[PDB]
């Protein structure tokens, strides 16, 4: 629930999510869609 979450801290949650997607494995927030 990143909407009810502070601003300066939720950015540190995306950067760990976005650090998986660069590998291929899906993530928590930044997900993939079928081709």
């Amino acid at each position: 629930l990143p909407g009810t979450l502070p601003l300066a801290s939720q950015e540190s949650a995306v950067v760990e999510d976005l650090l998986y997607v660069l590998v291929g494995v899906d993530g928590r927030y930044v997900s993939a869609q079928p081709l």
Binding site: L19, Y20, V23, V25
Partner: protein
């Protein structure tokens, strides 16, 4: 890999086990191409894959061939210098008649 579990994580495992996902993909597909072949016919079906095109495989299978083709070159160096073939199982391509 087990000694470090006491640190490594999933996204860290991918790089550790990225190479043994290939050797375990040639060998796991080398035993299906030669299923019913026995004798020399098997040493001829593990040679059809030697030319994988890439140097990471053309240099793996070309080693298993150097072991599988050792018994074949054992009959040959026996049937050439001594002329005494002996194989209860029919493997050598020279078949005698009692």
């Amino acid at each position: 890999l087990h000694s470090q579990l006491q640190s490594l994580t999933l996204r860290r495992l991918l790089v550790w086990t990225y190479d043994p996902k290939i050797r375990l993909k040639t060998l796991a597909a080398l035993v299906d191409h030669c299923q019913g072949r026995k004798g020399g016919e098997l040493a001829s079906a593990v040679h059809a894959y030697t030319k994988t095109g890439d140097p990471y495989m053309r240099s793996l299978v070309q080693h298993i061939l150097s072991l599988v083709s050792h018994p074949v070159l054992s009959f040959l160096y026996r049937w050439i210098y001594d002329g005494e073939l002996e194989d209860t199982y029919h493997e050598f391509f020279v078949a005698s008649d009692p």
